[PDB]
């Protein structure tokens with residue numbers, strides 16, 4: 001698990017410090033450009049959260065589409081590939097395991113890449129690596145049958161390819177089974193998304209102190 | 216800046232392990248790497264090495 | 265060789281054109297100049313603020329006030345010019361760490377791509393890497409990642425192994441490819457098929473296990489020499 | 492005109508339907524001149540092409556282009 005972005009929160013300086021007062025502002029004008037300076041800092045990192053998600057996901061040119069028939073040599077991808085019932089299955093469990101309001105000057109600009117887009121990039125990244133393998137990252141996406149791809153990755157770590165075919169049926173079962181335990185280990189054990197939850201906890205705890213200080 | 220250090224690490228783990236098979240030791244999961252699968256998340260990313 | 269040299273020579277040509285014509289081509293280097301100079305500007309503009317004293321020019325508050333009372337106003341400037349100078353320093357210590365993160369990335373891209381051919385995917389340009397060329401710049405560095413990109417693909421029919429004499433035959437370095445009528449092996453990234461002799465396949469076990477193989481003939485070069 | 496988004500109320504742009512590669516990010520998936528008018532549309536991820544998977548068919552390139560990006 002890795003965080004890639006925080007909430008694009010933004011705060012209006014003068015409305016926080018003064019809060020719709022004419023007497024206070026004309027004082028705040030004496031402190032030079034502190035108000036202008038912070039406001040620029042906060043929209044400097046708000047516009048950067050859009051560059052973070054635009055780098056992790058937007059790595060591909062065209063949005064590949066997974067085929068209708070799924071004959072992946074015995075490998076069962078039902079868990080990761082998208083399900084049109086609603087976004088993928090495992091992804092749907094991830095969106096349930098987190099617990100993600102404005103008062104005065106505070107706000108939350110919405111992220112540029114909507115979640116049903118972010119969920120779409122991660123489908124092309126899935127349909128290229130299932131069908132094409134390495135190549136959709138290097139240029140024109142060449143297709144290669146999956147059961148043959150894993151043979152060409154076994155040839156990576158130093159295992160001659162004969163091992164796969166000669167064990168294809170079992171290997172597919174281990175892989176299919178290993179994927180199964182994931183959602184179980186994810187669903188059962190709470191505190192499985194410790195990393196993403198902090199970046200939500202901290203960044204929201206920090207906002208809380210900002211408002212408490214108004215009192 | 217702590218997140219731009221992770222966003223850059225995820226931008227690498229996707230280019231180095233989803234878009235290829237990485238030879239770096241222990242970069243993508245304990246063991247010799249075979250492949251990886253992105254999965255979106257609320258504000259992050261989840262790899263299935 | 266001759267064509268490859270032309271593509272490379274030509275590709276280098278378009279660079280200066282794309283660089284000269286399209287302004288905003290050095291967006292990255294220009295910001296680090298813009299920001300870091302914009303930030304200095306605000307530091308000086310802050311010298312003209314009252315912070316609540318009678319006047320923002322330390323000479324006048326000093327020119328027309330007795331020392332006991334003056335330092336009460338001078339204190340309101342010092343307490344401000346300090347907070348505004350210590351704000352500038354902090355934003356630089358943060359901004360410099362963003363550059364030491366890039367200076368370290370360029371120190372790597374030069375050691376990993378100029379001083380060698382990097383196998384990392386998508387580290388040095390989109391595509392399989394061939395080489396790279398440093399170029400200085402005002403305050404940065406510019407790499408010219410010369411990469412190999414395939415094109416003009418054609419569909420073929422594949423088969424994981426070749427069952428010959430009951431034994432399977434797996435390709436040593438290649439993929440078993442057929443133009444419909446004749447089967448071949450070829451390097452996996454550039455169409456160049458060849459006749460399936462024995463020295464480009466290796467054998468293992470009978471051909472009942474692995475699904476998808478086809479029945480074919482692997483010719484032995486030793487036999488035409490026995491006769 | 493007046494057009495409503497998830498980010499807010501956007502007046503001055505004429506909403507359209509065909510998607511483009513987006514120019515001026517606005518928010519919630521919506522971006523924003525094209526022929527003397529300001530158009531506000533949905534981002535496109537790019538041309539959607541799903542490649543023809545088989546269980547027995549590979550596709551191998553026959554020519555390349557060595558190209559020079561910058562960085």
Ligand SMILES: *[C@@H]1O[C@H](CO)[C@@H](O)[C@H](O)[C@H]1NC(C)=O
Pocket residue numbers: 506507508
């Ligand atoms: C876009 O499509 C919707 C639904 O089909 C339609 O109501 C609307 O008029 C269209 N907008 C334009 C500008 O044609």
